[PDB]
Structures are given as structure tokens and as C-alpha cells.
Amino acid sequence: EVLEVKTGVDSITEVECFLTPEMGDPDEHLRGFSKSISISDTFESDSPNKDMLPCYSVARIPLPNLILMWEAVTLKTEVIGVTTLMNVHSNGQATHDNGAAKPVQGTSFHFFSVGGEALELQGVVFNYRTTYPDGTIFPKNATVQSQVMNTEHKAYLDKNKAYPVECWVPDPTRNENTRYFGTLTGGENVPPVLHITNTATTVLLDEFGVGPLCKGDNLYLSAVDVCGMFTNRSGSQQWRGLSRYFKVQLRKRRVK
Amino acid sequence: VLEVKTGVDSITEVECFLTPEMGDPDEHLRGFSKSISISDTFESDSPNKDMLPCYSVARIPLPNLILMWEAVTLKTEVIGVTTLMNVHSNGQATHDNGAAKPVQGTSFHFFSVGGEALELQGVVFNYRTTYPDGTIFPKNATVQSQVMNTEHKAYLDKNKAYPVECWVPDPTRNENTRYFGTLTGGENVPPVLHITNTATTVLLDEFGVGPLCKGDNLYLSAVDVCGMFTNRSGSQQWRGLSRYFKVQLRKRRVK
Amino acid sequence: VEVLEVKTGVDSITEVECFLTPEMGDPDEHLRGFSKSISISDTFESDSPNKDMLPCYSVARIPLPNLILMWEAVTLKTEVIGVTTLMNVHSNGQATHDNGAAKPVQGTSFHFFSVGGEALELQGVVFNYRTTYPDGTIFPKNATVQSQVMNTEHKAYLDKNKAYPVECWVPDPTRNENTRYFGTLTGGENVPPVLHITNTATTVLLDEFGVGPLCKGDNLYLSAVDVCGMFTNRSGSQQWRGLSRYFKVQLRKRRVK
Amino acid sequence: EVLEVKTDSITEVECFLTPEMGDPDEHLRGFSKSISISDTFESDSPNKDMLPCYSVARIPLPNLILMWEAVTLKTEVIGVTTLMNVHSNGQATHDNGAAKPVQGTSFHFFSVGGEALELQGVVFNYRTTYPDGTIFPKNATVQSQVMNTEHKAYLDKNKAYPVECWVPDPTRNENTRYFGTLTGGENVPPVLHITNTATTVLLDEFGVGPLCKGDNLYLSAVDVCGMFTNRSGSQQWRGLSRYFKVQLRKRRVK
Amino acid sequence: EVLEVKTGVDSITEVECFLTPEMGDPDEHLRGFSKSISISDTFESDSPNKDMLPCYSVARIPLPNLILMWEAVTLKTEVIGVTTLMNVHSNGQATHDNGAAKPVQGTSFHFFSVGGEALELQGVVFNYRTTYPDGTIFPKNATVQSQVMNTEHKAYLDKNKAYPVECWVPDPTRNENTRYFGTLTGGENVPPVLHITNTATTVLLDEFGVGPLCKGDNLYLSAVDVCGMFTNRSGSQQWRGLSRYFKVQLRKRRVK
Ligand SMILES: CC(=O)N[C@H]1[C@H]([C@H](O)[C@H](O)CO)O[C@@](O)(C(=O)O)C[C@@H]1O
Ligand SMILES: CC(=O)N[C@H]1[C@H]([C@H](O)[C@H](O)CO)O[C@@](O)(C(=O)O)C[C@@H]1O
Ligand SMILES: CC(=O)N[C@H]1[C@H]([C@H](O)[C@H](O)CO)O[C@@](O)(C(=O)O)C[C@@H]1O
């Protein structure tokens, strides 16, 4: 039972943080990148290394200790460091003779969510015979049905650097206490289009004027910002990701 | 069509997912078509069944009820969009040492909510195409069938039977259904798939009346051909994904 | 026409529902919806396209119930019919690469429709004034080099089906007071078709003063072009492909003085 | 001081402006000369018939203190479907294919004002020598490649001001409304919408449209649709005419 | 605390100017261009020449001396010289035999801000081993974490032609007293799309009806307009920038 909002000086707070991307980090110099992508020799033998798999990011933010619950009302969010994609002068492959290096481009996924509990995930796999690596949490006992929808694959985004992007999505049958937004833009040559502004606000209230209600006084933020692939001189490609800023305004809400 | 009932018991909701029906050429390839082959002449076009994506449909029974369930709102979403980030599974490298070419090219994204079966009109790219045993296709195709032959009328009344390429929603009918679709062509067309649990489509017409569910049945239909997967060899297969539906319904009295 | 009040009553409304088939050239008895394959002249002076190679405007004059009262067109629902046919990539087209599917229909499109109370009015404009348009078409007569940009002599009525080639006529913006027209040319040879369908969208046909097209002689004029792109054969030869268009129009009786 | 609107009180301007693309010979109205490339910045010296220019018409209004105030505009590019001629000495896209359609860099621009469009000069390359019979930035310096405030002009002559070295001056033009889109890239496809159902309101944030000094309305346009490539591969700009219809009303001023 | 707006003919003022782009200016004939872009063999050896790095533009505009503050309320802005990109006859590379020159295209960054103090910057680098050149102001003591987010890299955009675009962005964790807008459009061949009009106004008021308040009676304007790359006959590529016009309206506001 959701009752009234509490007012007065004491009754609002705000959360401000950033989530780093988790692209795989194949060595000590390559934070924000994946390992270069290799292609299996057969469909059955698909078997990606952990460092080659971008994962969902998540942070659990503790809120001032409070029945009253913190209610998330608005979000401002922004991808951090968009201009880094203008470095086309290192380690790259020329577009044509004497040209600059091919920039980061191709498949992107940009995703973020704000909830009063962990994001709920449904497992779907491109190829059910893919062997996901040790160190990742992935759909277990995958069958051919898992290539389209196997309802056995439920999980919570409850751990950072763990849930690979390619085999999990937000579960649309759950997540009543979360708001989520994502865009997959495919193709090998698609250009990144990245907007920044400190003037845009998303309102998190549902159809009844109620935002996510924070259980245990924790706010859950989740994100993926795979911007595309970087291409080395050899032609090998590595995913590149960026950090995401969150600012969330919250108010106290009485419940029963 | 009279008034809406109110009160605790007067609303219900349907929540489900429709699986895609892309052809399923073997026991490992659910969600995929058979690789596509090209006829040697225009006249000799003869696609195999496993190579033809078909419309999906589910009839959802509603609480037994003159009142009729009226579909009012819809939330819908393509499920498993991130699978298209698998570019390491024996695809064809974009260039020497590159990652695999992702799923791309021609897509059809379509969904409908009705109080009866979606009504279909048959149109063919090529009237001499021999559609295969086990599909339901425009019968007695003439050259006029390439643009409009009003004989080709059907109901989307069976799963994995109606090929996407030779049927569309009949604009001359479907008064009790709401449909939406986008065909995006070209072989290099990039998929653009959005997800969110914050978007609702209102199903009410210009008089504030939604689809009215005959016999207490809700009809959901879909196609989500996302593009084609290219194998190492160059062969291509349609790839489809599931669609989530959530529909809100209220009891409406009628005479 | 001084326009006066709308008439009411069960008797006072009617609707028109039909489809216009595309007129792409139809080069033989198996190729309804296609043009002849396209060939290119070696000079501007030798441009002489065959009729079967030229897409034309579609038109239908629809008789309305006989009636001073006039039928006033108020709303339109319209839809391109058969959009999913473009998923046929297995019918002797040209493989995009070794072992791949056939290149789908793509490239230059023109999607156009109008609703009016009289024939659509046309202005002739030509890419190349020395193009000789063929017998059996209606085209800009006495073309001069000024016809490549604007020659006010080239006025016509879309008063005949499969006759007015798309490429040399457009709706005349200096006229057409009693018609509503809408069109998009999307160029480029690799341009992907984007075709939306739905039965929930309505276009209101009333002007800034709340008046829609008034049907002279109790006729409603519907016009369309839906050139979807080009189909590429295995040989590399290319043919325009078109699709039919559905129209549903609501009309009401309007008194005029 | 702008005062009340009069309520005889309205008039309408209807016309078209032809494109001015270069017109290299008597058969190529609407096209430019084929484009050639200087081998150095210093040697850039385009011929006039290779340079699209701004189009302008000064339209005299009924003699009238009252001024004509421009309130609404309807506008359209004329002949959009000519771009479907892919059978006329173009270059096949591939063996046995149709000709490459017009595509690549486009500039679509129109303005309505109560005086000549005010122009600022900016040049890609300050060492470009602009030809006789054109009006161009004079005394160009390297600063002219980004902003040289010396280059002020009025769009006061047709077939004269090259598109490439002039833009509307955003520091002036209070008495004009202008709108333009430059869509670059060599392969970019043209997207041309036509309809007779769209109106643009010309009033500013205070409810005042352009006021016609000396009872003249100034219409300006550029519609470079792209480049046509012929069978040899050479490329030439292709432009189209623009329709304007403008509603005006009489306004008293002090 | 923000109190009432002043009224009267004397209560408003306006600022009108342009910011020139700062692309590198490799010689006396190439204002508005960078130096040719080259590609270092490794991240380790990445060492961009100063003339090769586009920088942020900034101007500090003094306002009429004024407790009252000037409050920025509206902005009109425009890229100046968009039609220059139609010069495809000047020292370029023909797209195909006998064709015109390939126009300016590829990665673009269009950005502008209006504030009552210097734009606040956060350093993010594509590659932490990039050696930024003498004469630039850049993230100091970069580590591998600087490739995603390192909170030590805080700066003010307080100097023209000094802060490279590629290693700095607006700090979303600050800039309360500034409004900023930017778009990074990536890709090797992405076409420029440039709109111009004198009929569009951006409102600078925040959600409480308050615009940027000008400390010390100074308005801060910042911009980047990297339009793409110019490809010369050899195929070497240079960034090309254009100037940006600003018109800002301000009003007097009382504060305590
Ligand atoms: C940015 C970078 O470090 N590139 C290097 C990559 C990556 O380190 C690995 O691909 C990580 O998986 O390795 C190479 O052998 C290669 O693939 O060509 C050399 C190249 O310079
Ligand atoms: C995803 C998958 O199964 N791919 C395999 C395909 C398909 O099974 C068939 O094409 C179905 O028609 O078959 C191959 O022989 C091929 O065409 O190259 C091997 C390839 O790895
Ligand atoms: C759809 C179709 O019929 N395609 C066929 C075309 C057309 O009939 C003509 O081009 C009409 O002009 O004719 C061919 O000889 C060709 O050009 O390659 C064979 C091709 O399969």
C-alpha cells in the first residue's frame, strides 16, 4: 500500500555516482577494452574467453537510513568521455592509404536502469552450444529453446563484471520496481552517435505517480555502454566501453 | 457497445511471449532459417519450408464471462536483443582478423492485438513462386497477385504456417484488431532494437473502444525477423527473436 | 464556391474504400508490378526510354452517391499493400557475395498519394529536355532547356491511368487548392526501403479553415505512386518494383452557394 | 515601434525561383560545369559555370506609416521526380545496372525578409581565386577560413553570389527569417518531401513578421540536390526550382 | 538564494559574439585545419603533435558591472560558414576517376555551453600512455583507470587553444551553473549534417526557472565544432573546424 509523500527540509536526498564499464580488461594497459575478438572454427565450438566478453555493470548505493521508503523520482544520466573517440592517431588501421585510423564503430549497446532492487534478468543465447567461460554467470542447462526463450534462465544482476551482455537481457515479465532503457545498434560499420547535456531529465514515476521504492534503503543502478569496436593495424577488433554518470533524486514515501 | 464495468473484479491482464518461427532447419537451429538459396530462373523459384519465416500467433484464453473483454493497453518488447553481440560464433570475418559480421540486413518487426484472428491479404513478389507443402499460401496465384488479387484472403489461425513474404495484414478488414509493422530492407541494414518497461501503446480507436474479445479469446500475432546471420562460408540464415506482450483488459457490456 | 454548413443525419456521411494498383511498365505477361530493365543512353540527346521502362502515376476517379450539396473529403487512412514481398530474396536475384542471399529491392523510391475533389494538377519538369518520351505516354510537349528547371507551359491533369510518367511530372504547387497531396522521393542506389504499416493512423484532410476537398460532379480523385526501389536480377540488370496502395476516405455532405 | 495590424488589409505573393547552378552550355540549365580539382590550394581557380550561386528575387508589393508584414510561408522544391531519370548518360552502378542517381552534398536553403538577405563571407581556402562575374569575399586572408568580419554583403543580385563562400550573417538579418540544411558526404542520398499542407509561420517571439522596407519582399533560395555523375565519371551539381507562397498583412509602425 | 527578477528597460542586456575554432593551425595558410593526422604504431608510442590536436574554444565576456547578478535566459547559436563544405574542387582526392573531390566527412564533435563561470572539465583518455604535447593542458599522472574514469583529472576550461578535445569532457558531476550540449558523431565516412536558421532559441532556465548566474559579471561561452576531416590528394587527412555564433539574453536577478 503506497500512501503519501513526506515533505519538508529533511525529506529529499540525492545520489550521484558513475559506473565504470566492464569490457573484459585483457591486460594492465587495456582497462575499458575487451580482448580482441576471435571467431570459432565451427558453430558448435563457440567458446569465448572471459576477457572477450563485456558484462553488465551494477552498483548498489546505500541511502540515508530510515514505514518510510526512499522513492526514486528523476534521473539525469550521461556517458562519460565521449570525446576519446577522436583519438584516431594510435595503434589503428588506416581507412585508406595515408588516412587516419578507422575510429571505434560497429555494434553498440547502451543501457541503463534505476531500481529499488536488483535488475531482473532473462537469459537468451545466440547459440545454445556456446560454452560461456568460467568466471562468468550465464544461462545454465541451455537447450535449443534457449536460443528463443527458456523461462528457466532467471537471474538477478547482483554482481559486477559477471553477467555477460550477450546472454542476458532485462526480464520484461518482472522488474515492476525498476525502470530500464536500452538500445542495441548493430552492423559492423555503424557510427557511434553520442549526445551529452546536463539539461535532460528522465522522470521515473509509473502510470500512478509512483517511482521505484528502495528496499532496505538501497538504490540499484545498472549500465552497459559498449560504444563499438576498436580496430588494430592487424585488423583484430576489441570492444570499447565508457563510464556512465547517474544523478537520482529521491523523496520519502510512506507505505504499509 | 455500451458502458465499461468498474470494481475490483473488472480488469485482468495477459502476459506472455511469442516465439519466432524462422524455419528451424534442424534440432540445433531454433530461431534460425535454413540457409537461403537462389533459384536459377525467376520462373523456377521454389523455396523450401525451413527457409521461410512465418507469422507467429497465440490465442490466449481469458477469464470466462453480455460482457466482453476489451483490450485497452499494450506493452511489448523484443526479447534477447543482446544476443546480436555474439560476433565470435563461426561467422564470416568482416576483414582479415576482424570479428564476425553481425546479424544485419532485411528486417520485419510486426505485432498485433485483436479480439479475433488477424485478417490477412496475400501478395507475392513473384506469382510463379512455388510455395512449399506444409505452408499456407495464396492459392491460384495469377500475375495480378504480384500487386493485388482480392481472392487471397485468410485468417492468421495457425502457427508456423503462413509465410511472412506472401501475406500482410488486410487493410480492408481488421476492424477488431490493432496492428503495427515495419519492413526495413537492404542487405547491410543495421538492426536498431530499443527496450524499455516504460512505454505503453493505447489500443483504443477514435471512439475510445478497444478490440473486443470474441469467445473470451485474445489474439496476439508477431514477426521479428531481425536480419540475417552470415556463416563463415558466406551462406545466410534469417535470425528471429521472441516478443513479449502485456495487455490490459476491462469488461465492457455490449448489445 | 462559398462554403456553408455541414449537413447532419444518418444520410449525410459516406465512405470510399479501394486500392490503386501500381503502374511500373509491365513489360510482359508475368511482370505486373515491375518495369522493363533499365538501360542508359550514351548521351543526353539520345535518351529515348521505352514505355515499359517508365513508371507512371496511378489514378482512380471514384463515383460518389449522386447529389447545391457536395461531398467533402474529411479523413484518409492509407497503406502500402504487400510490404513483406520484399523478403523474397531467393528468386533469381544477384547474390550479395559468394553463397549469400539475393540483394533485396532497394534504391530510389517515390511514395506519393493524393486525395482531391478533382483531377490532380501537374507541372512538367524534366531531368534532360532532350529526352524523347514514348508513344502512349503523356509528357511535356515543346520542351526547352528551361524545362529542366521550370517551364510554365507544362500544365496537365492527372486524368488518365498508366500514362503520365512519374519522372517528368510533379504536383503543381501553384494550383491544387482542391486536393491534398503528400510525397517523398528518397534517392541513392543503395537506399533501403523503410515501409511502415498500421491500421491506427488517420490523416485529416481539412484546410486551415476546416474545409476538405470538395468533390466536383460527385467524383473523388485518388492518386498514388509507390516505387519501392529496384530489383536486381542475377545478370545485374535492374527493374523498378511497385506496390498497390489502399485508401479509405470519409466524406460528409457540405452545402455551398 | 510596431503598432496595430490593419484589418484591403492582406495580400499574397506567389512565385518560383530558378536554381543558378552554372549552366555551362545551352543544354544544361540546372546543372553546373563538371567539377575539376585543383592540384594545390594556391592554384584553386574555379570557373563561374562550375559554381552554384544563391537565387534571389525582389518582389514589389502594393505601394502603402504602414508596412507589409510577412506572416506565413508555404514552400516546395519543384520537380523532385526528375531524379528518377536513371537512364540518361549516367554511370552504371555495376555491370548491366541502372545509372547512379543524383546524390552527394546537398544544400537546401530558403529565406523570406523585408530587405535583402545579409551575407557573411567564409571560404574553405583563402587562396581560392573566385572568377569574373561573381561577387566574392574581397581581400581574403587566412582568417577568412574561419571568420573575417570584413566580408559583409547583401544578396542583391541573382546568379552572382557563390554558395560556397557566403552564408547568412547570423549577427544581422533581424528582418529576415532563414532556414538551411547542408547535408555532406559523396554518397548521401537526397530525401525530398512534397506536400501542399505545410505552412511555416514567420512571426518572431513578439508576434512580428518581416516588415517590407520600401514595399519589397525578398525571397532567397539554394537547392543543390546533389551531383549527377555521367558515364565518364565526371560530376556536376544538379539543382531545382523553389516555389514560394507568402501571406502578408498591413502593419502600422511609428 | 535566488530572489526576484528586476524589471524596467535597464534590467536586460545581451551578448553577441563568435568563437573561432582551434583545430591546430599547422601553418600560416591553414587556419581552421589541423595538421595531417598520423598513426603511432603503439599506444605506448602515441605522441600527438600539438598542431594535430583540436582544442576547446572559450571566451570570457565581461558584462555591465553590478546584490544583483546577471542571469542568462536564452541562447541563439549557429555554426558559421557551413557552405564552405561545398568546395570540392580544391586539392582533394577524387572519389573515383574524373570525379569531384571527396568532401569533409568522418568524426565530428559539435558542442557549446553557456555558464556563469568556467566550464568544468573531467579528463578521460582513449589511451593513458598518450604523451600530450608541450603547450597543451591535459590529464596529469594518467593511469590505466584514466581510460574509463579517474576523478583526479579535474580542470576548468580557462584558456583558449590549450585543452585538447580528445582528453577532456564537461564534468557531469559539477557544472550546476552552466548549460552544455554536445554530439559526437563517429565513423570514418559519416556525412556532416549542418542546420542553420535564425528562428530557434534555446531556453537556459533550469527546472526551478533559474538560468546561469554570472559570478563577477562574467559570461562564459565555450564551443567545439570539428566538422569532419578534409582528405587531400595524397589521402592524408586533417580535421576541419568552423566558428560558432552566440547570442545570449540576460536579465538582472537579486540574490542573498
Ligand atoms: C591496443 C592493443 O594493445 N593492440 C594490440 C593487440 C591487443 O593487445 C590484443 O588483441 C588484446 O586482446 O594485440 C596485437 O597482437 C594485435 O591483436 O594485433 C597487437 C596490438 O597492437
Ligand atoms: C549456424 C549454423 O548451423 N551454420 C552452419 C550452416 C547451417 O547449419 C545451414 O546452412 C542451415 O541451412 O551450415 C554450414 O554447412 C554452412 O552453410 O556454412 C555450416 C555452418 O556453420
Ligand atoms: C524478374 C525477371 O523477369 N527478370 C528477368 C529479366 C526481365 O524479364 C527483363 O529484364 C525485363 O526487362 O530478364 C532477364 O533476361 C535479365 O534481364 O537478366 C532474366 C531475368 O531473370
Ligand SMILES: [K+]
Ligand atoms: K561449445
Ligand SMILES: [K+]
Ligand atoms: K516455381
Ligand SMILES: [K+]
Ligand atoms: K532523345
Ligand SMILES: [K+]
Ligand atoms: K588561386
Ligand SMILES: [K+]
Ligand atoms: K544582431
Ligand SMILES: [K+]
Ligand atoms: K607515449
